[PDB]
Design a protein around this motif. Structure first.
Motif, PDB file in Angstrom:
ATOM      1  N   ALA A  77     -43.018  11.598  25.751  1.00 38.10           N
ATOM      2  CA  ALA A  77     -42.171  12.754  26.021  1.00 38.10           C
ATOM      3  C   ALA A  77     -40.808  12.633  25.350  1.00 38.10           C
ATOM      4  CB  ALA A  77     -41.990  12.947  27.528  1.00 38.10           C
ATOM      5  N   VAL A  78     -40.273  11.414  25.227  1.00 38.21           N
ATOM      6  CA  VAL A  78     -39.030  11.228  24.484  1.00 38.21           C
ATOM      7  C   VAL A  78     -39.289  11.317  22.983  1.00 38.21           C
ATOM      8  CG1 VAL A  78     -38.292   8.945  23.696  1.00 38.21           C
ATOM      9  CG2 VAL A  78     -36.956  10.127  25.430  1.00 38.21           C
ATOM     10  N   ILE A 137     -29.089  11.182  20.437  1.00 37.26           N
ATOM     11  CA  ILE A 137     -29.365   9.779  20.745  1.00 37.26           C
ATOM     12  C   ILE A 137     -30.483   9.234  19.861  1.00 37.26           C
ATOM     13  CG2 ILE A 137     -31.016  10.296  22.588  1.00 37.26           C
ATOM     14  CD1 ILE A 137     -29.823   7.916  24.148  1.00 37.26           C
ATOM     15  N   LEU A 151     -39.397  12.755  34.982  1.00 35.98           N
ATOM     16  CA  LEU A 151     -39.324  12.396  33.570  1.00 35.98           C
ATOM     17  C   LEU A 151     -38.968  10.924  33.405  1.00 35.98           C
ATOM     18  CD1 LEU A 151     -39.738  13.112  30.816  1.00 35.98           C
ATOM     19  CD2 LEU A 151     -37.629  14.411  30.748  1.00 35.98           C
ATOM     20  N   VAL A 152     -37.968  10.460  34.154  1.00 29.70           N
ATOM     21  CA  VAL A 152     -37.435   9.115  33.979  1.00 29.70           C
ATOM     22  C   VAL A 152     -38.387   8.068  34.534  1.00 29.70           C
ATOM     23  CG1 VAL A 152     -35.590   7.594  34.799  1.00 29.70           C
ATOM     24  CG2 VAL A 152     -35.043   9.829  33.848  1.00 29.70           C
ATOM     25  N   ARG A 199     -40.776  17.226  31.225  1.00 30.54           N
ATOM     26  CA  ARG A 199     -39.971  17.681  30.097  1.00 30.54           C
ATOM     27  C   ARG A 199     -40.162  19.166  29.841  1.00 30.54           C
ATOM     28  NH1 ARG A 199     -38.889  19.356  25.450  1.00 30.54           N
ATOM     29  NH2 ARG A 199     -37.139  18.444  24.277  1.00 30.54           N
ATOM     30  N   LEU A 218     -30.777  15.768  27.635  1.00 28.85           N
ATOM     31  CA  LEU A 218     -30.220  14.416  27.586  1.00 28.85           C
ATOM     32  C   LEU A 218     -29.031  14.275  28.531  1.00 28.85           C
ATOM     33  CD1 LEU A 218     -29.614  11.614  26.483  1.00 28.85           C
ATOM     34  CD2 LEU A 218     -28.716  12.640  24.404  1.00 28.85           C
ATOM     35  N   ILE A 276     -29.972  14.769  32.409  1.00 32.40           N
ATOM     36  CA  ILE A 276     -30.694  13.651  33.000  1.00 32.40           C
ATOM     37  C   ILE A 276     -29.823  12.403  33.021  1.00 32.40           C
ATOM     38  CG2 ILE A 276     -32.658  12.094  32.648  1.00 32.40           C
ATOM     39  CD1 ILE A 276     -34.277  14.450  31.827  1.00 32.40           C
ATOM     40  N   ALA A 277     -29.182  12.081  31.894  1.00 30.15           N
ATOM     41  CA  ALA A 277     -28.294  10.922  31.901  1.00 30.15           C
ATOM     42  C   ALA A 277     -27.167  11.116  32.907  1.00 30.15           C
ATOM     43  CB  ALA A 277     -27.740  10.657  30.501  1.00 30.15           C
ATOM     44  N   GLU A 327     -29.060  10.340  36.521  1.00 29.85           N
ATOM     45  CA  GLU A 327     -29.793   9.146  36.922  1.00 29.85           C
ATOM     46  C   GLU A 327     -28.961   7.883  36.756  1.00 29.85           C
ATOM     47  OE1 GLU A 327     -32.432   9.548  38.456  1.00 29.85           O
ATOM     48  OE2 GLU A 327     -32.824  11.664  37.995  1.00 29.85           O
ATOM     49  N   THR A 328     -28.162   7.806  35.691  1.00 30.53           N
ATOM     50  CA  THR A 328     -27.447   6.570  35.387  1.00 30.53           C
ATOM     51  C   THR A 328     -26.430   6.248  36.468  1.00 30.53           C
ATOM     52  OG1 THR A 328     -25.755   7.746  34.163  1.00 30.53           O
ATOM     53  CG2 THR A 328     -27.708   7.041  32.949  1.00 30.53           C
ATOM     54  N   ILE A 337     -33.634   0.087  28.836  1.00 27.82           N
ATOM     55  CA  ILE A 337     -34.568   1.092  28.359  1.00 27.82           C
ATOM     56  C   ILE A 337     -34.009   1.893  27.188  1.00 27.82           C
ATOM     57  CG2 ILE A 337     -33.736   2.804  30.041  1.00 27.82           C
ATOM     58  CD1 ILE A 337     -37.331   2.050  28.630  1.00 27.82           C
ATOM     59  N   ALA A 338     -32.709   1.780  26.921  1.00 28.21           N
ATOM     60  CA  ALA A 338     -32.068   2.504  25.836  1.00 28.21           C
ATOM     61  C   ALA A 338     -31.623   1.577  24.707  1.00 28.21           C
ATOM     62  CB  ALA A 338     -30.873   3.301  26.365  1.00 28.21           C
ATOM     63  N   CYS A 354     -22.369   4.889  24.526  1.00 21.15           N
ATOM     64  CA  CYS A 354     -22.604   5.924  25.531  1.00 21.15           C
ATOM     65  C   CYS A 354     -21.511   6.975  25.547  1.00 21.15           C
ATOM     66  CB  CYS A 354     -22.702   5.275  26.916  1.00 21.15           C
ATOM     67  SG  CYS A 354     -22.992   6.483  28.218  1.00 21.15           S
ATOM     68  N   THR A 384     -38.023   1.603  33.181  1.00 20.97           N
ATOM     69  CA  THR A 384     -37.142   2.740  33.423  1.00 20.97           C
ATOM     70  C   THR A 384     -35.730   2.228  33.684  1.00 20.97           C
ATOM     71  OG1 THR A 384     -36.873   4.775  34.685  1.00 20.97           O
ATOM     72  CG2 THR A 384     -37.630   2.810  35.890  1.00 20.97           C
ATOM     73  N   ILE A 385     -34.836   3.138  34.097  1.00 26.66           N
ATOM     74  CA  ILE A 385     -33.482   2.749  34.482  1.00 26.66           C
ATOM     75  C   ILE A 385     -33.545   1.931  35.761  1.00 26.66           C
ATOM     76  CG2 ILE A 385     -31.213   3.603  35.219  1.00 26.66           C
ATOM     77  CD1 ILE A 385     -31.338   3.992  32.475  1.00 26.66           C
TER      78      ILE A 385
HETATM   79 CL1  LIG Z   1     -37.561  13.658  27.152  1.00 29.07          CL
HETATM   80  C1  LIG Z   1     -36.091  12.817  27.743  1.00 29.07           C
HETATM   81  C2  LIG Z   1     -34.852  13.122  27.200  1.00 29.07           C
HETATM   82  C3  LIG Z   1     -33.706  12.480  27.656  1.00 29.07           C
HETATM   83  C4  LIG Z   1     -33.793  11.520  28.656  1.00 29.07           C
HETATM   84  C5  LIG Z   1     -32.534  10.828  29.138  1.00 29.07           C
HETATM   85  O1  LIG Z   1     -32.025   9.914  28.150  1.00 29.07           O
HETATM   86  C6  LIG Z   1     -31.355   8.817  28.788  1.00 29.07           C
HETATM   87  C7  LIG Z   1     -30.625   7.940  27.772  1.00 29.07           C
HETATM   88  N1  LIG Z   1     -29.389   7.401  28.359  1.00 29.07           N
HETATM   89  C8  LIG Z   1     -29.317   6.321  29.152  1.00 29.07           C
HETATM   90  C9  LIG Z   1     -27.992   6.133  29.492  1.00 29.07           C
HETATM   91  N2  LIG Z   1     -27.275   7.114  28.893  1.00 29.07           N
HETATM   92  C10 LIG Z   1     -28.145   7.888  28.198  1.00 29.07           C
HETATM   93  C11 LIG Z   1     -32.426   8.095  29.516  1.00 29.07           C
HETATM   94  C12 LIG Z   1     -33.542   7.641  28.805  1.00 29.07           C
HETATM   95  C13 LIG Z   1     -34.581   6.990  29.466  1.00 29.07           C
HETATM   96  C14 LIG Z   1     -34.502   6.801  30.843  1.00 29.07           C
HETATM   97 CL2  LIG Z   1     -35.807   5.970  31.754  1.00 29.07          CL
HETATM   98  C15 LIG Z   1     -33.402   7.264  31.545  1.00 29.07           C
HETATM   99  C16 LIG Z   1     -32.362   7.911  30.898  1.00 29.07           C
HETATM  100 CL3  LIG Z   1     -30.974   8.458  31.908  1.00 29.07          CL
HETATM  101  C17 LIG Z   1     -35.033  11.216  29.205  1.00 29.07           C
HETATM  102 CL4  LIG Z   1     -35.192   9.983  30.504  1.00 29.07          CL
HETATM  103  C18 LIG Z   1     -36.179  11.862  28.746  1.00 29.07           C
END
Ligand SMILES: Clc1ccc(CO[C@H](Cn2ccnc2)c2ccc(Cl)cc2Cl)c(Cl)c1
Ligand code: HEM
Length: 402
Positions: free
Chosen positions: A81-82, A90, A174-175, A187, A234, A237-238, A241-242, A287-288, A349, A389-390
């Motif tokens: 999905a990413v 990113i 998603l995450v 997504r 992006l 979600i960021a 969750e972060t 994960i990033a 970031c 994951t995070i």
């Molecule tokens: Cl399709 C799609 C698009 C965007 C994201 C989010 O992108 C962030 C990157 N990031 C991390 C810290 N600052 C930025 C991320 C990536 C993976 C995970 Cl597990 C968690 C996060 Cl929050 C995701 Cl998750 C899915």
């Protein structure tokens, strides 16, 4: 018959919220900047495990951020999905990376983050008002750690908080999904929602960063509609969750180091340094760290070959004892300068200073309003997210003096 390998499976899972997994401690202790690992699908990749080498490789343009490359080091099936086009910045390299990132930077400046402090304090104390009015016990995650950054990033983006149950759920799916199908569905749910919001803003020019991108860059053909969607997703979600994970993991960690938590309560000028140390120590976003080599790279006698995947594991790099003396000791008074929890270089970031503001306000608010806060279960009973994951906990039962 012996099972010893020189390419251990990667990633590993934490058993303690703030400790390196045993396998990562092993990688940390092994000399050399690089180590072979085996990803979920059997493919070999490199991990970077030392601090200066991690900065060097994060700054090397030959390590591409392009997730659509067939050789990019995916750590789980959900990665597809990413790998969905188009990529947000990113996943772009210079020069494209810069042209897209600069469409968003104005919302994340130091001046803008300072202007946000009253609003963030209002949101933090509002959700504390509510959680404390109802009395213990409570799940700190659903009641505080997640809604606070959600409400903040929604205002930043121009996304209506009225829809928060919808996109908070999609964001989680998603995450945290472990299969490509579940991730792709989440997504698509967010994309369709964001595509409708764009159309609404084309009718009625809207607030926030999504509003600004629709009115300017999209209207000038300078960003594709679907790039805008990926970019908004992006940040949304960021944004959620972060910060939520840092909050829950910082509470767990501080309650396990009560001498330092007490010192922090007694002198709030220590909070900025404590936030840096907690970012270094908890390093929630390995994960990033994924990259793909577009050319051979020589690293201290080891050769990364064009087409190989490379994961810069910032949690392990942040435990490099040549940079942080006694690296596995939490020390809110140490210099945690130069840590890699936010990365390094052109992709460092974008939200780092919003994250620093939120964690400062949050810790000060918890120490002010709930000084008797304590876990309602033992630490060993909490369920930690896996290394795909995070980092964090999906629930955190807490209690306090009513
Ligand atoms: Cl399709 C799609 C698009 C965007 C994201 C989010 O992108 C962030 C990157 N990031 C991390 C810290 N600052 C930025 C991320 C990536 C993976 C995970 Cl597990 C968690 C996060 Cl929050 C995701 Cl998750 C899915
Ligand atoms: C403590 C919380 C956070 C941590 C540990 C963290 C970690 C990271 C890391 C390690 C990267 C580098 C990725 C790479 O090099 O490929 C990154 C990039 C990014 N983060 Fe965060 N992040 C956090 C919070 C946030 C927040 C709140 C936002 C809100 C928008 C955000 C938005 C971004 C963006 C947009 C990028 C990509 C920057 C670019 O590619 O130029 N992050 N983050």
């Amino acid at each position: 018959t012996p099972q010893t390998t020189d390419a251990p499976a990667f990633p590993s899972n934490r058993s303690c919220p703030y400790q390196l997994p045993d396998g990562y401690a092993q990688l940390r202790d092994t000399p050399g900047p690089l180590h072979r690992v085996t990803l979920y699908d059997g493919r070999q990749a490199w991990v970077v495990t030392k601090h200066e080498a991690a900065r060097k490789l994060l700054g090397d343009p030959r390590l591409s951020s392009n997730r659509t490359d067939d050789n990019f080091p995916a750590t789980s099936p959900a990665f597809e999905a990413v790998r969905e086009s188009p990529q947000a910045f990113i996943g772009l390299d210079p020069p494209e990376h810069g042209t897209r990132r600069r469409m968003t930077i104005s919302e994340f400046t130091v001046k803008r983050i300072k202007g946000m402090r009253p609003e963030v304090e209002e949101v933090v104390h509002g959700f504390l008002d509510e959680m404390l009015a109802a009395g213990p016990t409570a799940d700190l995650v659903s009641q505080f750690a997640l809604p606070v950054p959600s409400m903040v990033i929604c205002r930043l983006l121009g996304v209506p908080y009225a829809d928060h149950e919808f996109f908070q759920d999609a964001s989680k799916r998603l995450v945290q999904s472990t299969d490509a199908q579940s991730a792709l569905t989440a997504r698509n749910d967010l994309a369709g929602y964001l595509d409708g919001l764009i159309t609404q803003f084309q009718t009625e020019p809207g607030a926030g960063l999504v509003g600004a991108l629709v009115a300017d860059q999209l209207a000038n053909g300078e960003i594709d509609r679907e790039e805008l969607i990926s970019t908004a997703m992006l940040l949304l979600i960021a944004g959620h969750e972060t910060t939520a994970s840092m909050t829950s993991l910082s509470v767990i960690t501080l309650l396990d180091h009560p001498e330092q938590y007490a010192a922090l309560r007694a002198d709030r000028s220590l909070v900025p340094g404590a936030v840096e140390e907690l970012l270094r120590y908890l390093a929630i976003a390995d994960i990033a760290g994924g990259r793909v080599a577009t050319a051979d790279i020589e690293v201290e006698g080891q050769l990364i070959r064009a087409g190989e995947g490379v994961i810069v594991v910032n949690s392990i790099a942040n435990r490099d004892g040549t940079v942080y003396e006694d690296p596995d000791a939490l020390d809110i008074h140490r210099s945690a300068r130069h840590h890699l929890a936010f990365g390094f270089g052109v992709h460092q970031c974008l939200g780092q200073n919003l994250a620093r503001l939120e964690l400062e306000v949050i810790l000060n608010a918890l120490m002010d309003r709930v000084p008797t806060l304590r876990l309602a279960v033992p630490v060993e009973q909490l369920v930690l997210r896996p290394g795909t994951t995070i980092q964090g906990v999906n629930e955190l039962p807490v209690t306090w003096h009513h």
